[PDB]
Amino acid sequence: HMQIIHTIRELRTWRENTGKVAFVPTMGNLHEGHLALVREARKRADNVVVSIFVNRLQPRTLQQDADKLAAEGVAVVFAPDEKELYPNVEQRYNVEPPHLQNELCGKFRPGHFRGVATVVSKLFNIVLPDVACFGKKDYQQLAVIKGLTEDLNFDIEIVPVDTGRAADGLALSSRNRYLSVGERAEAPRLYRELQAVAESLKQGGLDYAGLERQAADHLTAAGWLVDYVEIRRADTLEMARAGDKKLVVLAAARLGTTRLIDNVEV
Amino acid sequence: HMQIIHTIRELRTWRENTGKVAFVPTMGNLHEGHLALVREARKRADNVVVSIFVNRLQFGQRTLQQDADKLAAEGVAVVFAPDEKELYPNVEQRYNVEPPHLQNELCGKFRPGHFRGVATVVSKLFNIVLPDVACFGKKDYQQLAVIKGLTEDLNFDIEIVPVDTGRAADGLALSSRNRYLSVGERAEAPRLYRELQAVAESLKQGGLDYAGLERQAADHLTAAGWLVDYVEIRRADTLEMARAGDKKLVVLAAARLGTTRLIDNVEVGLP
Ligand SMILES: Nc1ncnc2c1ncn2[C@@H]1O[C@H](COP(=O)(O)OP(=O)(O)NP(=O)(O)O)[C@@H](O)[C@H]1O
Numbered sequence: 156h157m158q159i160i161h162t163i164r165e166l167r168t169w170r171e172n173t174g175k176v177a178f179v180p181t182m183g184n185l186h187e188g189h190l191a192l193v194r195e196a197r198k199r200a201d202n203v204v205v206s207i208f209v210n211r212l213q214p215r216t217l218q219q220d221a222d223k224l225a226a227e228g229v230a231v232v233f234a235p236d237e238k239e240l241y242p243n244v245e246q247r248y249n250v251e252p253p254h255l256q257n258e259l260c261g262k263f264r265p266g267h268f269r270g271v272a273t274v275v276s277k278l279f280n281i282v283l284p285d286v287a288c289f290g291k292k293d294y295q296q297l298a299v300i301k302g303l304t305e306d307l308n309f310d311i312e313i314v315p316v317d318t319g320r321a322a323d324g325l326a327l328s329s330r331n332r333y334l335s336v337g338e339r340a341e342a343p344r345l346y347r348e349l350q351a352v353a354e355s356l357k358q359g360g361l362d363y364a365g366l367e368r369q370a371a372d373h374l375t376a377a378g379w380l381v382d383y384v385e386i387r388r389a390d391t392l393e394m395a396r397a398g399d400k401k402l403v404v405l406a407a408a409r410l411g412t413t414r415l416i417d418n419v420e421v
Numbered sequence: 422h423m424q425i426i427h428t429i430r431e432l433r434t435w436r437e438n439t440g441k442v443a444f445v446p447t448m449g450n451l452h453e454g455h456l457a458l459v460r461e462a463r464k465r466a467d468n469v470v471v472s473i474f475v476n477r478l479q480f481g482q483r484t485l486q487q488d489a490d491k492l493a494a495e496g497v498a499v500v501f502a503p504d505e506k507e508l509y510p511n512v513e514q515r516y517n518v519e520p521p522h523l524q525n526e527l528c529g530k531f532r533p534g535h536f537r538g539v540a541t542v543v544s545k546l547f548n549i550v551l552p553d554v555a556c557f558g559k560k561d562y563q564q565l566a567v568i569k570g571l572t573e574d575l576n577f578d579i580e581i582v583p584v585d586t587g588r589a590a591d592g593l594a595l596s597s598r599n600r601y602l603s604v605g606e607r608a609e610a611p612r613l614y615r616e617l618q619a620v621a622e623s624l625k626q627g628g629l630d631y632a633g634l635e636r637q638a639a640d641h642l643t644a645a646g647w648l649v650d651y652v653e654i655r656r657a658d659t660l661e662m663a664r665a666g667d668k669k670l671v672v673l674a675a676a677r678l679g680t681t682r683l684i685d686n687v688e689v690g691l692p
């Protein structure tokens with residue numbers, strides 16, 4: 156049944172003489188939001204590879220992770236150590252995103268999306284998948300991966316998966332475990348404020364900047380420390396232009412020291 | 422037997438049924454130097470793809486049929502000749518393979534953006550052709566090191582086969598740009614390799630003043646009419662800076678006769 160491959164060589168040996176492969180890269184500490192990716196992967200290929208890797212370029216629960224994936228019919232858990240993927244100290248050749256890497260979440264995480272684009276390219280060249288699933292909660296990550304896939308001619312179908320949420324709307328994330336009881340009760344307001352922006356856009360709203368500030372002002376007045384609220388073009392995160400019909404609203408804000416992100420496509 | 426394929430989709434469809442593939446990326450205008458790579462590729466796989474592709478906006482800062490004709494005799498199965506829009510549909514390349522500081526040394530110092538563009542278009546071609554084996558000429562020694570580097574760092578499962586420089590009778594490294602040389606310039610061109618060899622001979626004889634050998638070669642080419650970009654002694658393969666006791670060395674040079682920039686190198690193995 157399920158197999159745990161730790162080397163590039165063993166992964167490739169398994170993958171040759173296998174048909175269609177759907178691939179889900181993760182960093183472990185798996186939760187229900189990740190399984191939405193795995194379940195969608197299994198609906199697009201019989202053989203699903205889930206990688207678990209923590210990337211020094213961008214909380215180990217290995218046994219509990221693999222049991223959850225086993226019950227979802229995953230074929231291979233690829234969990235290499237750091238030296239397997241980075242045999243030298245440095246990563247000399249990096250996949251360099253455009254200026255997007257310094258916007259939104261990238262502004263306070265320099266080097267982060269470069270590290271995501273590089274490790275995902277490495278994983279792509281290791282697993283050689285036909286389909287790869289990524290969650291929409293990390294929308295900017297998704298744009299970067301779609302972009303590198305196109306620009307580097309990776310023959311891989313990128314499948315966005317919808318954000319799994321709690322009953323009150325909060326996007327599922329391992330970050331949510333940091334919230335105190337008080338902050339967790341307040342955390343659903345992020346998605347509430349994004350939805351009301353999407354409704355204003357649905358009801359013919361034209362002032363992008365006005366809507367972003369209002370949501371930001373509501374969060375700040377309720378105790379949040381807002382990093383950004385931004386309306387951008389869906390999928391690509393290109394600048395929103397007046398008259399665009401495929402939009403997305405994104406925000407990042409801190410309750411205490413925990414930074415939460417969410418988004419709504421309008 | 423030989424096919425000319427222009428689209429990525431047709432290349433992928435052909436490649437899918439085929440087993441092992443050896444790959445030779447070129448900018449066309451093919452000469453015997455190129456055919457050396459093609460012969461090496463043909464020794465290692467039944468199916469050899471040669472790509473012909475230029476994009477002067479991204480890297481690089483004879484007709485196709487005439488090129489295809491030279492390859493048809495050599496057992497090439499596919500000439501892959503996409504146009505600019507096929508590989509760069511938005512013109513802009515948003516995601517680039519970024520080399521380390523190496524990209525700004527040696528030829529990189531005189532060719533801003535060039536090795537980033539080479540690294541990127543080679544990765545793209547690797548992802549289109551999906552070869553088992555790719556051949557590159559040692560004449561472009563820094564380029565070869567850049568391609569070995571990205572192949573390892575990005576985990577491309579591709580064997581990188583270097584191929585020795587094919588030369589004219591008088592030693593001049595074969596190159597498409599040699600056609601642009603005046604009669605007088607062409608007769609002067611073999612001095613570059615000659616001086617590189619005399620540097621290698623000083624090294625094989627225990628010479629330790631690397632800086633002085635570099636300067637003498639550059640001053641001599643300068644005195645002979647050339648405009649020298651550089652002459653440098655480096656560690657072989659990695660192109661790291663050479664140190665006093667080093668045994669595996671390469672001497673590299675780039676220099677211009679009038680309008681034409683020429684490069685060459687000589688490897689040295691010291692006992
Ligand atoms: N609630 C969610 N719904 C859908 N996809 C999700 C969700 N949370 C994460 N994902 C996706 O699953 C992958 C998560 O990788 P990983 O960073 O290991 O999880 P994470 O929850 O985002 N870590 P954290 O920074 O603590 O939130 C990415 O493709 C995410 O887009």
Ligand SMILES: Nc1ncnc2c1ncn2[C@@H]1O[C@H](COP(=O)(O)OP(=O)(O)NP(=O)(O)O)[C@@H](O)[C@H]1O
Pocket residue numbers: 446447448449454455457458556557558559560561584585586587588594595596597598599
């Ligand atoms: N004389 C040569 N001997 C061996 N390999 C060579 C030689 N010249 C070129 N190659 C290799 O052939 C491949 C295609 O190189 P390409 O840039 O298309 O040729 P080129 O002659 O250097 N073009 P140009 O710089 O315009 O004159 C590369 O891997 C080169 O390193």
Ligand SMILES: [Mg+2]
Pocket residue numbers: 447448449450451597
């Ligand atoms: Mg050429």
